[model samples]
Target: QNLKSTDRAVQQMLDKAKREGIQTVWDRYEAMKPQCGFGETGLCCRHCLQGPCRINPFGDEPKVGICGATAEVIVARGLDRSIAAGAAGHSGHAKHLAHTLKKAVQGKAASYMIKDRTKLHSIAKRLGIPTEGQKDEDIALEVAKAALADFHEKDTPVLWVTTVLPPSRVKVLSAHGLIPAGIDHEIAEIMHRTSMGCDADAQNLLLGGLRCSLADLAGCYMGTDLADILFGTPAPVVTESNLGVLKADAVNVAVHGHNPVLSDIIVSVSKEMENEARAAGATGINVVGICCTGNEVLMRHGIPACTHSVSQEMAMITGALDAMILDYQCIQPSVATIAECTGTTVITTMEMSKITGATHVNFAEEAAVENAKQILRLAIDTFKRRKGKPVEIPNIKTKVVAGFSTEAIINALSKLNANDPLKPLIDNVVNGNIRGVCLFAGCNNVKVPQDQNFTTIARKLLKQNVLVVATGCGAGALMRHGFMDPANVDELCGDGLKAVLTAIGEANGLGGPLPPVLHMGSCVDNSRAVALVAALANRLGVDLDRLPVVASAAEAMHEKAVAAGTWAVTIGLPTHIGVLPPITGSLPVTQILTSSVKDITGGYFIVELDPETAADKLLAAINERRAGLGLPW
Candidate 1:
């Protein structure tokens, strides 16, 4: 009775899985029906063994928790912990990049080196580090050390947060005590305060979570900037997407995870291993991406993305994939079980993240190349054994024009006005050639029909001339449809949006309009969207809150998505989440987030389940921002 996804290929694989008695995320989620209401409403508190406390959602006994905590207090503590976890997740990814950069600069990791000197110096200049008389190695070392130092408590605000945002935003965040002293410190503070007997004031807890959410932004920005410096800042690249990218005659390997440190090396080494695959009775090695790791490579190289997020198991079920290499985050353990059914070697890298049944290939920066080769050879050998196995390769793929990094967007705009690139974008918004920009971000949730919410909202907004951009699986969803196909602009966009896209596309000699939705890298690359808006805010002499811009996590499912959505609201954007969050249990907490928080941060949450309603509300928000700026709606 449950239609799991909107994609036809996914449906086919799901049917196959059902016929073969193989379980998937959908099955597991279905089996766990009647989910706990206390957890659903965030009315449960399990922090201490005094009791697994519960606050009644109904007007009954046990109105508060065993610790005398109200629904608002319990929900606030839960949210604070979630924000801390999300912040920690992103910051850990950034810290990994910092350590890698440090190793590269020290000549300890010869496999890695600075690929984007321009970005390196740009980052150094922003940090007030002198790069004039320094070697690229010295500048990189300084940037690496600075990134590492930002994790600890310091007198200054987090540089990645402060420097990346507009001056007005910095002022607003600082005035509200929302500016984080350090990324880890804010995360640590939330954990400390949210423990058994600490801060109970719901409002105070939220404020602390907001601060930690900004720390998530700093970690995200640091991740994007440092990754760009290590691996070149992405430019527009033509790639393909979907399961059809898998080659039946080749050894197919899917790189899965968030970090590019290992995956990027694997991409480079895969070229040298082509002969090895050919010798194993295969045509060659074909590397495709999955999830954000897929996005990292797809943005930089033109590697195709096979699948993403909730639909990961669908890729393995094809029975054609020789190996699936994983790094961390959003990787379901169920994939290991599916690997057994398909004879795919599920290789887990990274000591921190390991699946029990998967093969472990210890990945170290010092021996990155060797580690990558070992992984590839394992795939090749496996392909030899699995050759001629009955496989059902879906004949569905989409042409994706991705990698519209902030720099790439400016580069394209500079073609129209070299001396003043932001002018063209600013003029369009002011004159109503473009109404506003909406960023579709975060993951796909099993609760909703996969990609349905995103496609619905995007179609509605595009018809109204709202410029759309996406990241992570949100981009994955759009690309799988035709939103990322530049040629589809005529059919998808309104007159105003079409004209704007055409101007930029023609100026850059793209032959047609740019895609209706610009693909802006992975989740961490959400910073690119922020950086673009920050530039617009600076050019127009207004706070981010006043811009005709908004963001949506239409199928948000991860704690990382929560942190991103919170930070989006803090930075002054009307953020939307399709799935209902846990805080709705308490009217006070829900009211403050959806309405009263706007008075403080000029941003608030728009929690709605219907995509059409959400789109209308977002358009209403854009029109309000426009009228505030004295522009006709």
Candidate 2:
């Protein structure tokens, strides 16, 4: 029971759930412990009806499948399928945003507008779309069309993939046929190629996976791009996190899942209906976030995050939450079950995703405002019914300064050197004041102690002067642990990093240093990190693989994370994953991913389960890059 979380609020709520006879992810995870070894090591293959084959890990008589496929082929096929699934998820998200953007520009989505014309124009220009004299709506429509076009195969490579990376890296990926022809096309190809008795060569399958992973990156980049264009790009904002952000005296709405097309409008509509909430015997509407949806709103609107990732059940357990409104992705179906015990209304908005026991809002982008208003009303009514009821909020919250998009980071750096914003950061890294940059991305896993890996590894990295940036639940974990609080910089950062942060903060008139771990927004916003590194590489006339930078999904659990990590390596960064991927059964596949792949892509996986050792590995990777650049370590 004590193996669940390191968070005070999460532990308190877990205790409450235990007393009340409720279940959570941790409970479910424990019941399934000592999991299947065949699946754990990627030796199980069920792709076709030939047989649900399993290659023996112990070199038994059943060494190969009925089709004579070896361990490496089975593992590579499974891994390719996983990457395809991940790419499909992210690309689906991007395609949704594209449709929404198209609708908004067509005057169909009345509640939506081109919130950031600057962002729209930037994206258009990057895609080589002519935007000079055109209206913002026209440019946006074209941009939307371009984003939509990226889904299907075309003569040109996926623009998001070809344009986002530095020229050198793009050449590298192209040379290896790693540049995806289209986002959805690659995913479909992976599905077709990974079928039983198809593409049985392990090396060829891994290359196919790399191509699909680039599609994931393209999808993710467009997700961030369209999101910023439709719902303004995020800048730094001070906020709070944890269950303490829930309000017992108000209509507490917790937005779960990833898409922000509706959640951003909900934030808007919630403000307009504050008087209705007040008349319904509530103080006001408290719009909090959970999971990546939480990161989205928390980044842009400064909305408090109630909880994140695997610990999402705790928010509903508080009994203070009036509604758990979900969009799609990373939301546990068990939320509906918890809602039954807690009397919190679980609302599902997307038609593609609906819960059996939850209320369906059938949210349409066209009627976004009305839909948001309807959702808020449900929360308000629920709040009135549950008013003055016993609630357990745990009184645990942390000061978080998030919304550090790549543009935001550049803007802050611009204060010190307006003509060359990257100068200060590049100088610090070059001189060893900032050792190197490390991005903490992806989700929390039930297999790990909630945020234990993230916090432990982050602390070690900070002390060693590695600049930390985070996205998704990794950001949630660090911010909840006070890594995003400016006040903790002195205690968390090394002397050189502390000095650099203070200098930038003081220059920006922030009165102190920036947070130890910069919050870079949602999972899709990992593109922002890539953009940051690309800018540095372009400015320094270097390829991204040579930069003293790395990425880690310390407790990654989702298939989306697998795709993201694969792309990170494909783009040439030593990536880390605390939770081991299921490819250890195939020595060749594992060896290619962890070592030999770097020769081709200048990146590879660092699979370390221990946080302390993971941090050491990341630091060593950073140092090695610095050494390659002939910089002092």
Candidate 3:
């Protein structure tokens, strides 16, 4: 009788949905049960001219496809293709933001501005540009151009890998030929070399995956920089979340998807057009967040987050979401049908991503403010039509102390020790007051119980004194469940972790416990996690592989999450995936990912479907790294 989510509001919706005869992602997921064995095992391929291939998992049928591809080769090709798809999505996102920043600099995009000039100067300084006597736009253009060249330049390594990583790490990658020449070039190579009869060796094919994973890393760095410049670098903001954030008396608009270009405009317009909302017979406008789009606004504006990926439709089922506004990734196509039943309007905001049977609004950087005004007005109008309808917004939001940017973290550390901020955090790890960090990340899946994996696994880790942090949808889970609330200290955190968080909190003049799980940011902001680890590694004079940090994506089913897990291994973190990653069909390939990869990069992947067991393995990995460092466990 366990339904999709662990939240009470979601449970209420699931019950309501059954009585109302409304279909949800859970219904669709059940319809997809006993899914294709070939696809599940990474044994299906449609890449090249010869034929589509499906090797028999049963071994009674032909073990190899007509093209003579074995299971190992098939699994590697499928895995790399997933990695490439993820790289394309994230890197393409970065490329667009960079171009928009360029347009803003040239005074062509009126809706955008340089919000973080300090970050712009920091980027310029890192890129080795002489910033003296240059106007802000000029310096911004120079930085954007360098970012652009990283995508276009075919000869040199991407700017992120070349300048951001340490010389020792770069040398290690170069020695193994894992360093990429260009961001787009490596992605192109995946499609080229993985074609029929080319690069069929499984081990070599995985190297291609690692190279693309590094490109994914490059995209993450550039993406975060662009996010800060276009929007603003996130600072501490208090917000509440869950379906309870929805208002019965106000027009509610939920920002869904990945891009901040449109969502930031919506936030701006929501504040400016209060009269417009009131005139529509609504008390006011309540703009809430869902997914990473919610995260962007939550970080900057303290807007309440409504739900994440798996529970998005449940918010509409609350019958209080006037408009489910969206742009891109992690949105379900079936949401249109769900909204049709719930009287919620599914408004697609991007020209590129149009869901069939959903309303479309073209969002452009040139006229973002006007578009946002139009979008908010539409939600208000919809609210007017739906007035007097019975609505059920769950009373379940929890206050979250979010907006922990890399700079904000260092600033918090400085209040403890003025001269060296990293020293205090480092000493904690060295002395075992706090164990290593776990960068919990990625999306929600219906396969595992929604939010259960993250909550249970994180609690288990926290009880063992592991320092925990989350990003993207994982952060959404913590926010909704109250793990991100400072008041959860005595209940959730271990004595060791509680002391560390309280010390940090009191030193910063907050006389409360720090939130047990720090919400870093959206998926692209995994760059912030990378920056934190790199700083730790730099100070310790060790490779990233030697650090006592690990990454886990509990309940991830997205292709981007597949890319993320692979890249985590590439960067020398023991990556744990809650679902069984698709490569288990080939023992050779599975062995390579779970075991052999560590020999190569000091990182590997672990496939654990159970959260408690997953927690144990991660603790072991952190303690193993600690033992290697000659520290007490």
Candidate 4:
């Protein structure tokens, strides 16, 4: 009934907007509602023998028919599957880059080169690969091989990426028996162990799953090295494209997914398409992105991203998009079906991501520009096939300051204390009137009403002086509203945060360009934020549990968010939020996360819906923990 009410209200809004000749942002929202049942509870899993369980917290626990797997094992296996899926997704991306690098090393790929020479050199130095006097190509080859080796390396400290994390986190991971030996090995083991009649012990499965997930951290940082070299270490740049950013008077191409191989080529050819559109008496060609690939280009090239993972269909609904160019994950196969409904072109690029009802344009980095030009030409010529008038763009865009990588953060911190020094900034946080920071991040859900909870919680916490950091869709929400800039800290923050921001904001070279709510990369980069909190705790001479800090994903909607939050709690930072809804249906799972997990680990979880209430609860928890430790208020 609660869910129905929410759905009805949203549907009514959509219907009324259509009646009034106004377009709605919730077009896809309404369309995707029926598919959400699998997400609502545990009925979807068929993983284990002891249970083909439809375990509901509100109802009697369903029986596991054949195998003796308990509900806990069933839930754990389900969770492990998610972790495996997530890890595999990221690992596959890394593997693509690794293969590309290998080809580049052997001079087989001519289109790709080490674009960020400095970053390439730096990574080479970190991995102890020689680059002192080598040319860029030679250095890149060595760096590429080293990156590939890290994925399968049995020893040698997991190479370049993990180095960004604090030593203590490294030690804790080592102690917990969760350190991953190799990338393919960890993911492969999760697949093997979770299969029928394999490792059915839920606890062990979870530990293996977590280790598998954490291995991606190594890949993330290592990939950052590659991205920085290729994309020039994303600085704050302005570019705007969403559904609204599309143009009716032009050839509109929407690129979706995570793989940059074709997208980078698409970006190069998009300019030519703009020219072709002009030649065809249209305004121009416009290329926008969806999902992580959108973020990838937007962060570096300042291209406009149409939406994140869930917003792809919304972009398609705009009707002006002539072509939806897809490559990798999150490219809804339904997109091709929907494009048929609208007469839009659905062009699949990568060999791995072919879709039925979509035209295939097999793209390689070496041939990216040629393929992109061909696609652009096709989109331009197809513009006359539009059956309906283009929809009006929304007025919903917001100005956000994003692109704060870990390297950017370190640079910002150094600049913040250039004159007054780190001593005072360190002293203020340690003294504890300021009460440390809490990263209130993650997505805004309709279940929470207009997704205002994240913004409200962030604003309220900033008022109380807690340093609020954000990433993914959550950061996008704040950025749209201008709440993410560093200057807002002085106006919204309590004295302590204001002071810290003032001290560091100016010195960090953030005075003109940087944002206050540090945009620490993508969702995967939340680990960097975790590392920052842990680093602060260590620097301030406090135990992880005793630190004046906490982390929360107030409106979390992703498995990665839950995993990152869980890892933080496991490392002793209190995470204030329930496990995402999927994990909330089981009492045993909930209790283990909320209470008992603290016994094995040092921290626990809390679930709260109201942003102010959630903020207050976490603030109070931080103060209580500090008080118990006899630290400052």
Evaluated against the true structure, the overall lDDT of model 1 is 0.93
**Which digits, one per residue and each the tens of the lDDT, describe model 1 over residues 547-590?**
99999999999999999999999999999999989987899999
Instruction: Give the whole-model CA lDDT for all candidates, comma-separated.
Output: 0.93, 0.92, 0.87, 0.63
In each prediction, how many residue pairs overlap at the backbone (N, C-alpha, C within less than 3 A)?
0, 0, 0, 13
The positional error of residue 461 in candidate 2, measured at the CA in angstroms, is 0.6
lDDT of 2 at 497: 98
Best by lDDT: 1
**For model 4, how does the per-residue alpha-carbon lDDT over 142-183 read when each residue is reduced to its tens digit?**
777777777675666566435554566567667778667787
Clashing pairs in 3: none
How many residue pairs in model 1 have overlapping backbones?
Answer: 0
Global Cα RMSD, each model: 0.9, 0.9, 1.3, 4.5
The window of 10 residues in a row where model 1 has the poorest summed lDDT is 1-10
- Candidate 3, residues 22-127, lDDT tens digits: the string is 8888888899998988888888888775667788776487688778888999899889988888888887788878988999999989889999999888988977
| Per-model TM-score on C-alpha atoms | 0.99, 0.99, 0.98, 0.84
Give the winner by lDDT: 2 or 4.
2
Ranking by lDDT: 1, 2, 3, 4
Q: What overall lDDT, based on C-alpha atoms, would model 4 receive against the true structure?
A: 0.63
